[PDB]
Amino acid sequence: IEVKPINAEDTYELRHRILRPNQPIEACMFESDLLRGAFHLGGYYGGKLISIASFHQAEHSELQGQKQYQLRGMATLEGYREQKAGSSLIKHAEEILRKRGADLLWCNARTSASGYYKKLGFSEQGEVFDTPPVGPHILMYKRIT
């Protein structure tokens, strides 16, 4: 897997295909892409973008740490999962975040992906909640100090 910077617009196709296929493409144009300091990473394999992840500064009222970042749009294409594409994006992002002085990385994780974030050292906080129309989510976080 090769991890490279990508632009926000480069994420829409895979966000749409993997995360939100039953909504218009506009549902994948996350407003948070337009928040200060947002950045995006792609994982490439055999000449194809196959994994994506997006990060921006956002301090969650319920997590402790002066500077926090949120992960959105975490997805790897079927056929290319279980290759450490996702893990590679997260580790690369952790370097960028640590260099920026961020204290923690959090996600409103799909409960179906909770084991993935667990393997990457995230913890669950609070209770499972629903996010229309994309189902059960749970707050998860990793302290990176």
Total residues contacting ligand CAO by CB under 6 A comes to 21
Q: Does 141 bind ligand CAO (CB under 6 A)?
A: no
Is 55 in contact with 70 (CB distance < 8 Å)?
Answer: yes
Beta strand 68-76 pairing with 104-110: parallel
Nearest distance, CB of residue 124 and ligand CAO, angstroms: 12
Nearer to ligand CAO, 95 or 101 (CB): 95
Alpha helices in 1-145 (DSSP H): 12-14, 85-100, 114-119
- Residue whose C-beta lies closest to ligand CAO: 115
Backbone angles phi, psi at 21, to 5 degrees: -70, -20
How long, in residues, is the chain?
145
Does 93 bind ligand CAO (CB under 6 A)? Our answer is: no
Instruction: Pick the binder of ligand CAO from 6, 11, 38, 86 (CB under 6 A).
Output: 86
CA distance between the termini of the chain = 26
Query: Mask of contacts with ligand CAO, 13-52, x by CB under 6 A?
Result: -----xx-------------------------------x-
Alpha-carbon distances of 73 from 80, 84, 139, 145, rounded to whole Å = 16, 17, 15, 24
76 binding ligand CAO? (CB under 6 A): yes
Bridge partners for 3 per DSSP? 43
In the list 104, 107, 138, 144, the residue contacting ligand CAO (rule: CB under 6 A) is 107
Contact residues for ligand CAO (CB under 6 A)? 18-19, 51, 74-76, 81-87, 107, 109-110, 112-113, 115-116, 119
